[PDB]
Design an enzyme around this catalytic site. Structure first.
Site, PDB file in Angstrom:
ATOM      1  N   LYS A  50      -1.101 -73.206   6.752  1.00 30.38           N
ATOM      2  CA  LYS A  50      -2.326 -72.441   6.862  1.00 30.38           C
ATOM      3  C   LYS A  50      -3.307 -73.244   7.693  1.00 30.38           C
ATOM      4  O   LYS A  50      -3.694 -74.345   7.305  1.00 30.38           O
ATOM      5  CB  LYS A  50      -2.910 -72.121   5.479  1.00 30.38           C
ATOM      6  CG  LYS A  50      -4.056 -71.092   5.473  1.00 30.38           C
ATOM      7  CD  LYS A  50      -5.043 -71.317   4.304  1.00 30.38           C
ATOM      8  CE  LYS A  50      -4.373 -71.149   2.946  1.00 30.38           C
ATOM      9  NZ  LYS A  50      -5.337 -70.759   1.851  1.00 30.38           N
ATOM     10  N   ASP A 148     -11.844 -65.634  -6.982  1.00 28.23           N
ATOM     11  CA  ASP A 148     -11.353 -64.531  -6.107  1.00 28.23           C
ATOM     12  C   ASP A 148      -9.925 -64.071  -6.530  1.00 28.23           C
ATOM     13  O   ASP A 148      -8.940 -64.158  -5.764  1.00 28.23           O
ATOM     14  CB  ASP A 148     -11.447 -64.949  -4.636  1.00 28.23           C
ATOM     15  CG  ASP A 148     -11.568 -63.756  -3.673  1.00 28.23           C
ATOM     16  OD1 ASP A 148     -11.583 -62.570  -4.055  1.00 28.23           O
ATOM     17  OD2 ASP A 148     -11.579 -64.032  -2.461  1.00 28.23           O
TER      18      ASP A 148
HETATM   19  C1  LIG Z   1       9.860 -61.296   4.610  1.00 26.23           C
HETATM   20  C2  LIG Z   1       8.919 -60.405   3.796  1.00 26.23           C
HETATM   21  C3  LIG Z   1       9.685 -59.814   2.606  1.00 26.23           C
HETATM   22  C4  LIG Z   1       8.285 -59.275   4.599  1.00 26.23           C
HETATM   23  C5  LIG Z   1       7.747 -61.269   3.435  1.00 26.23           C
HETATM   24  O1  LIG Z   1       7.033 -61.167   2.364  1.00 26.23           O
HETATM   25  O2  LIG Z   1       7.283 -62.229   4.396  1.00 26.23           O
HETATM   26  C6  LIG Z   1       6.217 -62.848   4.256  1.00 26.23           C
HETATM   27  C7  LIG Z   1       5.086 -62.329   4.837  1.00 26.23           C
HETATM   28  C8  LIG Z   1       3.910 -63.037   4.699  1.00 26.23           C
HETATM   29  C9  LIG Z   1       3.905 -64.224   4.034  1.00 26.23           C
HETATM   30  C10 LIG Z   1       5.077 -64.787   3.517  1.00 26.23           C
HETATM   31  C11 LIG Z   1       6.243 -64.058   3.582  1.00 26.23           C
HETATM   32  N1  LIG Z   1       4.781 -65.962   2.868  1.00 26.23           N
HETATM   33  C12 LIG Z   1       3.430 -66.108   3.098  1.00 26.23           C
HETATM   34  N2  LIG Z   1       2.662 -67.144   2.705  1.00 26.23           N
HETATM   35  C13 LIG Z   1       3.098 -68.169   2.048  1.00 26.23           C
HETATM   36  O3  LIG Z   1       4.369 -68.386   2.033  1.00 26.23           O
HETATM   37  C14 LIG Z   1       2.158 -69.093   1.327  1.00 26.23           C
HETATM   38  C15 LIG Z   1       2.677 -70.007   0.379  1.00 26.23           C
HETATM   39  C16 LIG Z   1       1.799 -70.853  -0.318  1.00 26.23           C
HETATM   40  C17 LIG Z   1       0.429 -70.749  -0.068  1.00 26.23           C
HETATM   41  C18 LIG Z   1      -0.086 -69.838   0.881  1.00 26.23           C
HETATM   42  N3  LIG Z   1      -1.469 -69.762   1.147  1.00 26.23           N
HETATM   43  O4  LIG Z   1      -2.011 -68.857   2.098  1.00 26.23           O
HETATM   44  O5  LIG Z   1      -2.374 -70.596   0.474  1.00 26.23           O
HETATM   45  C19 LIG Z   1       0.788 -68.997   1.583  1.00 26.23           C
HETATM   46  N4  LIG Z   1       2.913 -65.114   3.789  1.00 26.23           N
HETATM   47  C20 LIG Z   1       1.589 -64.928   4.212  1.00 26.23           C
HETATM   48  C21 LIG Z   1       0.421 -64.532   3.322  1.00 26.23           C
HETATM   49  C22 LIG Z   1       0.770 -63.396   2.400  1.00 26.23           C
HETATM   50  O6  LIG Z   1       1.043 -62.241   3.197  1.00 26.23           O
END
Ligand SMILES: CC(C)(C)C(=O)Oc1ccc2c(c1)nc(NC(=O)c1cccc([N+](=O)[O-])c1)n2CCCO
Length: 295
Positions: A50, A148
């Protein structure tokens, strides 16, 4: 503590902080305005990087305070229902936080079936609601107030275990040795308690927000939709409460496994958390127990 990555190492793992969706082969996973989330690979090991971003609303010193406070809380609080910080960067001056990757995104997106993912079943929703309540409990046991709580800040692991995230605005509470007040009102309006919209800082506010999260889970509707009536989901308690509506009218239709009894029991928790009067609300330990009795 945590690992300290160089900015250059993080820039490498995220392909220049490549801004396209993973679909077309970029690295960007999501955005708030706190920052942008990038898919990273370090040690054969997939991570979330991030990168924090200044936006007209916050100092480039108030964004450093969210940085330090994320680190400060993640050091103190490790739990199976909270995300895990691996490390950080402060040199290169974007500022980055590095987490264990959550392959299943936010509850908000999983609820909306964004990018085509399948609808969560009732079975999965129940586990998620209990997981989330557990994470919140640990926080409140450790004298922390999130400020939040929302489905976008509930992440889902490779087993759809719910993990609370975004601690940049968290505050230490105390025994309640007196009502605490803000001059800087923070949070997400569609999930805020009325006392938090007036500037109180209390753990009872997290409970109200969580009650809104329970509504999203039951109904699959986001908390705010400008193109809907009612625009705010919270307004459903009153509809149902003033018999203009049944909870069964609003149960998400994209499940095949809901039963009346557990859905009503989940609704009865959400309805208690959503007391307008902060002191009439269940505490987190009570929410945890009732959700346990639900299954
Ligand atoms: C592959 C599918 C099934 C579509 C899917 O869900 O893909 C993703 C999409 C987005 C994502 C994904 C996966 N993972 C994250 N964020 C993280 O992994 C994350 C882990 C730990 C902390 C944080 N954070 O923002 O503090 C974010 N993010 C981003 C933030 C949440 O959308």
């Amino acid at each position: 503590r945590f690992h300290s990555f160089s900015f250059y190492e993080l820039k490498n793992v995220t392909n220049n902080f490549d801004e396209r969706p993973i679909s077309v082969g970029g690295n960007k996973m999501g955005e708030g305005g706190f920052g942008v989330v990038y898919k990273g690979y370090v040690n054969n090991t997939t991570v979330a990087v991030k990168k924090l971003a200044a936006m007209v609303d916050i100092t480039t010193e108030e964004l450093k305070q969210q940085f330090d406070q994320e680190i400060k809380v993640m050091a103190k609080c490790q739990h199976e229902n909270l995300v895990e910080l691996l490390g950080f960067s402060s040199d290169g001056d974007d500022l980055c936080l590095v987490y264990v990757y959550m392959p299943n995104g936010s509850l908000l997106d999983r609820l909306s079936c964004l990018d085509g993912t399948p609808p969560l079943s009732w079975h999965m929703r129940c586990k998620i609601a209990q997981g989330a309540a557990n994470g919140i409990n640990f926080l409140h046991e450790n004298h922390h107030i999130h400020r939040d709580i929302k489905s976008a800040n509930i992440l889902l692991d490779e087993a759809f275990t719910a993990k609370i995230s975004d601690f940049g605005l968290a505050r230490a509470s105390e025994k309640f040795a007196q009502t605490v007040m803000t001059s800087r009102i923070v949070g997400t309006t569609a999930y805020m308690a009325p006392e938090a919209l007036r500037g109180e800082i209390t753990p009872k506010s997290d409970i109200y927000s969580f009650g809104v999260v329970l509504l999203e889970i039951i109904t699959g509707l986001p908390a705010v939709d400008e193109h809907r009536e009612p625009q705010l989901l919270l307004d459903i308690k009153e509809e149902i409460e003033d018999e203009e509506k049944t909870i069964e009218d609003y149960i998400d239709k994209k499940m095949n496994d809901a039963d009346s009894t557990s859905v009503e029991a989940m609704y009865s928790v959400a309805s208690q958390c959503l007391h307008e009067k902060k002191n009439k609300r269940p505490d987190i330990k009570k929410v945890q127990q009732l959700l346990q009795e639900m299954t």
